[PDB]
Design a protein around this ligand. Sequence first.
Ligand SMILES: CC(=O)CC(=O)SCCNC(=O)CCNC(=O)[C@H](O)C(C)(C)COP(=O)(O)OP(=O)(O)OC[C@H]1O[C@@H](n2cnc3c(N)ncnc32)[C@H](O)[C@@H]1OP(=O)(O)O
Ligand SMILES: CC(=O)CC(=O)SCCNC(=O)CCNC(=O)[C@H](O)C(C)(C)COP(=O)(O)OP(=O)(O)OC[C@H]1O[C@@H](n2cnc3c(N)ncnc32)[C@H](O)[C@@H]1OP(=O)(O)O
Ligand SMILES: CC(=O)CC(=O)SCCNC(=O)CCNC(=O)[C@H](O)C(C)(C)COP(=O)(O)OP(=O)(O)OC[C@H]1O[C@@H](n2cnc3c(N)ncnc32)[C@H](O)[C@@H]1OP(=O)(O)O
Ligand SMILES: CC(=O)CC(=O)SCCNC(=O)CCNC(=O)[C@H](O)C(C)(C)COP(=O)(O)OP(=O)(O)OC[C@H]1O[C@@H](n2cnc3c(N)ncnc32)[C@H](O)[C@@H]1OP(=O)(O)O
Ligand SMILES: CC(=O)CC(=O)SCCNC(=O)CCNC(=O)[C@H](O)C(C)(C)COP(=O)(O)OP(=O)(O)OC[C@H]1O[C@@H](n2cnc3c(N)ncnc32)[C@H](O)[C@@H]1OP(=O)(O)O
Ligand SMILES: CC(=O)CC(=O)SCCNC(=O)CCNC(=O)[C@H](O)C(C)(C)COP(=O)(O)OP(=O)(O)OC[C@H]1O[C@@H](n2cnc3c(N)ncnc32)[C@H](O)[C@@H]1OP(=O)(O)O
Lengths: 280, 271, 271, 271, 271, 271
Amino acid sequence: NPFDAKAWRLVDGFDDLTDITYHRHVDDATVRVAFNRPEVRNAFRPHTVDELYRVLDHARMSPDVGVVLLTGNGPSPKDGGWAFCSGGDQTVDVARAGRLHILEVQRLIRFMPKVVICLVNGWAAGGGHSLHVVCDLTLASREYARFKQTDADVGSFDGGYGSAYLARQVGQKFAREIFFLGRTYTAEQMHQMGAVNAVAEHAELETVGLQWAAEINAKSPQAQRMLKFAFNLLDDGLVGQQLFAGEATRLAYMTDEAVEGRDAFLQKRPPDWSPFPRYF
Amino acid sequence: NPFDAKAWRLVDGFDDLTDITYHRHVDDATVRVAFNRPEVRNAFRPHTVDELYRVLDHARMSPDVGVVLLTGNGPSPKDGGWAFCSGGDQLHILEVQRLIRFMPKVVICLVNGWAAGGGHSLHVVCDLTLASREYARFKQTDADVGSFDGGYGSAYLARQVGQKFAREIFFLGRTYTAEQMHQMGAVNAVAEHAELETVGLQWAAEINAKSPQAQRMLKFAFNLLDDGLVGQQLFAGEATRLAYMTDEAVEGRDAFLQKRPPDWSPFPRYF
Amino acid sequence: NPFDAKAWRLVDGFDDLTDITYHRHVDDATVRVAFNRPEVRNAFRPHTVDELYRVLDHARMSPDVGVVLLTGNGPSPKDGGWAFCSGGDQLHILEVQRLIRFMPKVVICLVNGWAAGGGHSLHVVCDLTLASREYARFKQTDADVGSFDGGYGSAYLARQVGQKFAREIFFLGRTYTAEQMHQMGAVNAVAEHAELETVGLQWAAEINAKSPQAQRMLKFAFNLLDDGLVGQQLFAGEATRLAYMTDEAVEGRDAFLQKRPPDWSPFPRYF
Amino acid sequence: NPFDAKAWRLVDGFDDLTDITYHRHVDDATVRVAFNRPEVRNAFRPHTVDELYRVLDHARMSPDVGVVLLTGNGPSPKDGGWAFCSGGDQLHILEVQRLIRFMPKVVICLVNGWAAGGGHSLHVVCDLTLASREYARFKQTDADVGSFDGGYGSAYLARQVGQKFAREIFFLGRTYTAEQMHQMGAVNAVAEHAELETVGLQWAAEINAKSPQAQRMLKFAFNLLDDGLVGQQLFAGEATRLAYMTDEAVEGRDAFLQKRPPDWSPFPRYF
Amino acid sequence: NPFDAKAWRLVDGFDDLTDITYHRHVDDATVRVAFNRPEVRNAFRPHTVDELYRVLDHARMSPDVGVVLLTGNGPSPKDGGWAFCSGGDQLHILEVQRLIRFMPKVVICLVNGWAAGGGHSLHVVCDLTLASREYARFKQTDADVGSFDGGYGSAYLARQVGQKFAREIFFLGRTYTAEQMHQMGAVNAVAEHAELETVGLQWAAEINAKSPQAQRMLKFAFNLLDDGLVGQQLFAGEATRLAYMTDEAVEGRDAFLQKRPPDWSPFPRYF
Amino acid sequence: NPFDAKAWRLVDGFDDLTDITYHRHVDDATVRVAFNRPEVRNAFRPHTVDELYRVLDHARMSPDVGVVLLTGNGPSPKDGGWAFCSGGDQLHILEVQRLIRFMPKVVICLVNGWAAGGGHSLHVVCDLTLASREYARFKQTDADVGSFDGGYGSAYLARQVGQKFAREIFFLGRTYTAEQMHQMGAVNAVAEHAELETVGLQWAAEINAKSPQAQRMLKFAFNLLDDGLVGQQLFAGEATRLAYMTDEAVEGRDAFLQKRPPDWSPFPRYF
Ligand SMILES: CC(=O)CC(=O)SCCNC(=O)CCNC(=O)[C@H](O)C(C)(C)COP(=O)(O)OP(=O)(O)OC[C@H]1O[C@@H](n2cnc3c(N)ncnc32)[C@H](O)[C@@H]1OP(=O)(O)O
Ligand SMILES: CC(=O)CC(=O)SCCNC(=O)CCNC(=O)[C@H](O)C(C)(C)COP(=O)(O)OP(=O)(O)OC[C@H]1O[C@@H](n2cnc3c(N)ncnc32)[C@H](O)[C@@H]1OP(=O)(O)O
Ligand SMILES: CC(=O)CC(=O)SCCNC(=O)CCNC(=O)[C@H](O)C(C)(C)COP(=O)(O)OP(=O)(O)OC[C@H]1O[C@@H](n2cnc3c(N)ncnc32)[C@H](O)[C@@H]1OP(=O)(O)O
Ligand SMILES: CC(=O)CC(=O)SCCNC(=O)CCNC(=O)[C@H](O)C(C)(C)COP(=O)(O)OP(=O)(O)OC[C@H]1O[C@@H](n2cnc3c(N)ncnc32)[C@H](O)[C@@H]1OP(=O)(O)O
Ligand SMILES: CC(=O)CC(=O)SCCNC(=O)CCNC(=O)[C@H](O)C(C)(C)COP(=O)(O)OP(=O)(O)OC[C@H]1O[C@@H](n2cnc3c(N)ncnc32)[C@H](O)[C@@H]1OP(=O)(O)O
Ligand SMILES: CC(=O)CC(=O)SCCNC(=O)CCNC(=O)[C@H](O)C(C)(C)COP(=O)(O)OP(=O)(O)OC[C@H]1O[C@@H](n2cnc3c(N)ncnc32)[C@H](O)[C@@H]1OP(=O)(O)O
């Protein structure tokens, strides 16, 4: 079992969680967010997404958290099988019911100024596959990671990050193959294609996760933030620019030049820009 | 005063609002969301942003609301001056920008006074803008104080007025009238100050009289390329929803639960 | 020989074909489209392009065809050498590229031999590529002769193998095997020469066993952003088709013919 | 009536046209392509699109034609009303849009009356638009009936009038005059109704007086980035053709046929 | 005459200039760079481009210069005619385009006369354009002579005036006035001929009165997406510079030199 | 030692170089440009960037040079360790990045040792990379010291190795071998350390054996979309050059000088 209880502490205020677990590391700036429905191959129902959102949002807003490990608990108490996430659990009520609340989760992972590593501990199918795709990094169980894009089998499709963004990891030929055929791939296979960063022994998956997390946390958090947004930038168009530029704005705010401008507004005087040069 | 009290009721559950007001129209699928700090030219402080987010987010999830009217209350009790919003009280706001940008409803900015700094950037990111002829004033002051909106406020502005005018708006930081902004392409239409919300409601009614499904697809179709993968994600998400409703997708869902092979023969290969 | 005659039937109406062959599978929703000039390493002359266009266009419009297998016949009767296609016989081809790119079905290139110049570019633009272990040979010779595919052949290759490999492939013009191209990212899988079309058929069957609607949307989703407005046009066009089938769109269409106002109340504002 | 019969001759081979008319000018390298169902406000049915496609394709491949004038015949024999095209008779059309977009000739839309739905979208995708002052009426009705052009009709319109105006045009579905659309940026110029085709022909004459090669390159240069890989394919295709004509390309071609190594010494490395 | 000699002093080190003049304002952080061949309508020959490059580069690297005013001297001593620049004397210019595009300062083109061919394209690539009411004439003649600017001259012009107007400007090659280009969106404002440089200086002064850091970021924010990886490279480069000045970045630099591990505890994870 | 002295001669005019060396090959159209501070792991100080820029610029303008081999001299006389480049000595480098990116010749990085920080990023932006099996070490250390290359170093690396591997390279800052970077897609090929430049020269020779015109066009085709309007500028610039050489463009040029109307009748409208 990848989960090492000794390493994790419950996060305050999340006692009511049923479909998701949420831990903070005993020492490191890292959290563990996991699907907690192993009986159903960790499929998400609307309540799961609600909880996932809440938890990830909380982790986004925690200034002492640098890295999110996104995984699935297991194994299944019914048949011993391992799953990361098998996707969606298969008049005012109607709009609130049919949701794409998962697309919001995808955006949350994409936009949060911290690194999200998906630890694929088992089946990653449909929406669960797409969650892995959108995470920044992926580490996968050698013995048990299974990647299967089953959307088209049931008449569904992720026409967004699940597919188009996958192509920016494995290239257009591989990505089209993954969706068009819906075959099952191992960790090593996906690693060879370029969607999985590294493969780890099943029982060491979270240990390797934590080691990756610690290497990320050992660097300047400002740089890591800028970096994530630089990687996102052009692919995400104006949104990519908005988030990168937003960090540039924050950096500028801290400078002497920007204090001068702020001062002179409050003091009703003209600003003096003579101390600060025109860099080229 | 643009505000017609008879047309609006408060939305239940928002009694604690201090910096923002939130009304639903008496008949129409339209809400009114307004800056409520006219003494400070409707500048937003962090608490203002929190409320604006919650309010817009509630509007987003309200299935019986089709259109958001985003405006500012006034005038100033202190000097009679009018403001839509003067920007930050001197990153939560980027979240608000994205909320407006991604919400599957049309957001109309009603610029009833000054729109400056972040307040200006809020108008730019809205789908449509109507502006008070007498009182709307557009001023991009960011560079004055050493700040800049390097996102929707600037780059997206350029996709409305073109690259020359947008550079000018930000580089010089001049004040512009409703009619000028209308010529440049950032203001849809200009209205008599007192009629601004009347015109807003009329525009809202025309938007709400159309297929809601169509309107949502269209918004996302306009966002799509500009917003890259996020734009694709949102438009494709709506396509996925449409596909779920079809007989073909029922068959695929059936056959999975029934453990049998799916039959695709009834459904043709459209070209 | 990869070709299994028992598996294929000629398609009606194409008796006049000289440079290209065209078969429909005995059972499956799949066609076989093959260069038929093995004596000249399956190079295309203008008349080949004409036929290739007609044939691919026919396949595009055949509602009971889900997958196109694109390959080359052989071996050469003169020297026993194998070729998928060696390029132009030494702009109509750009049109064929676009047909392959825009058609709402999966095109698998089966590289059974040399794939050089334009023939290499044809492989690149297909959705998928399966290549003969023993005989697939990839060579971008364009620059040797003072020519260049500055479109899908090069820039799109880069979106398969990455910018360093794709530059390498064109700047040096070296010959690569199936396995090398598979390592690089341009070849989906390698198959024993004699089993190339058997594998192709198995791939085609797995593709055809899924929702045709989903496959169509997926293809256009993969093309979308890379193809800009054209990508959006094709994907959105499929969304439009999906919308037309809904109850909401029927109401809009009814109310127009019946001269009445439409009622949108049964249909919610999804978010 | 904008139509001057003395200016135009029928094109050989199109006697069977029912829903479209097709003329070549008596002296100029200009054709006239027109919707010919004035009784239904020039709505296109599936047969209309077939004809429109064939006709436009023929013009594309006519080497002595430089400019296409796309318009509508009228007025209505039933009520005297004028129409360019009112859209679908209440996806072949997406092919026509691509034909207009990709053809290496300038297509000028002459909006002589109503331009609604798909008919509005056809105007948008043409390179240029001239509009009848008295009679051009622009109405984007799609969302009224639960439909939407999520491609060139909307996203490309935004690249003419900007994102604010474009959203307005679709969200509200109002009717706009020639001069309003001119102000917004989607109409190049307004003409007196009766002079519409005369102005059309003068614009065409100015276009045809320039280097055809340059006009080609320019159209694809304007298309390029908007159309992503497809845009690049077409612009680079023209660059390939230009390269083929050079002495350097001749040397490369010679040396392959002559089985010798090529000599690149005469041709310098430009920078 | 727009030129006020009292306002300007020569820049040290440029006494060998023949085709270009280069002045620094007596008080303001503004330079005047001007074509100096009014006898040939300020056409640039390869020696002009050399000088223009050197001069613009010097202004780029001058830390006390905030704004470049680019213009043409006149009138012609032969015929009294005025010109900004008539293009190439009948690829070094593409380098100048990029120098203007990438320089972290605002370049204002003051079009005091004819701006044709390459001269038109220089105006298009500048950040802002102010134009002589009586004498600015914009004419894109390239296709007349079988040439074309397929880069910033055309594609980027479409990002100011929209795709319909930009296509018109190139395809017909008509002559436009200052006020027409102003209505289209390619000219920021129109000035009395005699006051063109005075208005230029006032605009410069308003630009120079704002945070230089902010203006730099803004320019690159406007260029960013349009310029793809180059746009990102420049904006990101400024972000890198900003980061270098922070306490966090000092800690990282210290710990490397001191061979110790860095401590990031003081600096929070902003969101 | 990869360096074979007998193969290289110094370039005239560069005897003042301290931090960089610059050789022309004795026979081939290939230059060797090399960091020359092995004692500090070939880190670049501002004077190094100055020289690197001048040298690369000179190679760009050398008509008789087709390929630039960019590398690092060694080993360290202090410790025997090998380096390509260790980054900045602990924005002029962004200029060098652009010079490599825009130059109309293939730049091959020969990573003969450590390639860290800025030095890693130089290797990323080169067209091709060959790496020493035993000594190439790739390590993106930026975030360790609170820095980042948010441009080509990172976003362009993702278009070589894909988004997962690129994020990993930067977020963890681990050290990779030649073979690992080869598997990822950032290194074209791996060579025996002592054979590194020999293989470089052989790659160079294959590049220089093709049509330089075609190589130029290909490099810009690969850059194009990624570099937005800059990529279009450069590609289009080459297309303009090609057009200038044609008969059609001579005709347009003639008729302007001769004051006559041009005749376009000999030149057809290709499609
Ligand atoms: C909004 C969205 O984002 C949409 C989506 O992703 S929809 C879901 C993804 N697509 C699918 O339909 C595939 C669903 N999952 C599977 O294909 C397979 O379960 C799998 C390949 C992941 C693993 O299969 P397996 O190892 O053979 O185990 P399997 O027997 O199928 O599953 C074990 C149990 O969990 C359940 N289960 C697995 N995935 C489920 C899902 N997505 N929803 C509901 N239940 C699911 C099964 O019903 C099965 O339950 P029973 O004990 O009642 O028989
Ligand atoms: C996170 C972000 O998004 C960042 C931002 O936008 S920062 C803010 C935008 N940029 C600025 O600094 C400009 C601020 N606003 C202004 O320039 C001007 O107030 C205006 C042009 C909008 C209108 O000015 P005006 O009609 O002359 O009235 P003015 O006297 O300036 O304002 C009236 C009062 O409201 C206040 N006010 C106006 N804007 C304010 C703001 N952004 N923050 C705080 N107080 C503000 C003033 O202090 C003034 O208060 P007093 O009664 O104490 O004197
Ligand atoms: C519009 C476009 O799209 C443009 C293009 O691609 S142009 C073509 C591609 N570029 C070229 O010029 C390369 C052409 N092909 C080749 O380089 C080589 O034939 C090859 C590497 C593919 C295989 O070479 P090979 O195994 O040694 O066989 P090879 O002797 O060259 O070819 C066998 C015969 O077929 C012919 N052939 C091969 N390719 C041909 C082509 N593109 N056009 C015409 N004939 C061709 C040869 O003339 C040779 O014929 P002969 O019996 O008369 O001698
Ligand atoms: C594939 C696609 O691309 C989809 C589409 O565009 S669908 C069509 C566009 N959207 C619509 O439904 C709007 C249709 N057109 C109209 O709104 C209006 O006709 C108009 C605004 C263009 C002009 O209206 P008008 O001047 O008042 O004339 P109007 O009475 O409506 O039309 C005259 C006749 O032509 C017909 N007509 C007009 N547009 C038609 C259309 N799109 N399809 C079929 N018939 C049409 C009408 O039925 C009317 O016929 P009758 O003599 O039998 O009454
Ligand atoms: C690398 C690139 O970037 C390419 C380019 O732009 S190429 C140049 C642009 N395209 C052209 O060929 C147009 C050239 N210019 C013109 O069309 C016209 O001169 C104009 C519309 C700008 C003004 O015309 P005008 O007011 O009637 O004056 P005009 O008589 O034409 O010019 C006055 C003199 O300057 C010269 N001149 C004007 N433009 C010139 C140019 N581009 N190159 C050389 N000489 C030029 C003329 O030869 C004429 O000289 P003469 O005294 O010997 O007769
Ligand atoms: C503008 C920009 O573009 C910004 C940048 O890239 S900043 C620089 C890149 N990032 C860094 O700080 C990393 C610097 N380099 C390193 O991490 C390591 O030197 C290395 C991994 C490349 C190799 O390390 P190594 O094999 O263990 O040798 P190492 O002991 O570190 O270096 C040997 C000597 O060269 C020096 N050196 C190595 N890189 C240097 C650099 N970037 N700046 C200055 N000196 C450097 C060291 O100080 C050391 O010197 P001493 O003899 O005085 O001790």
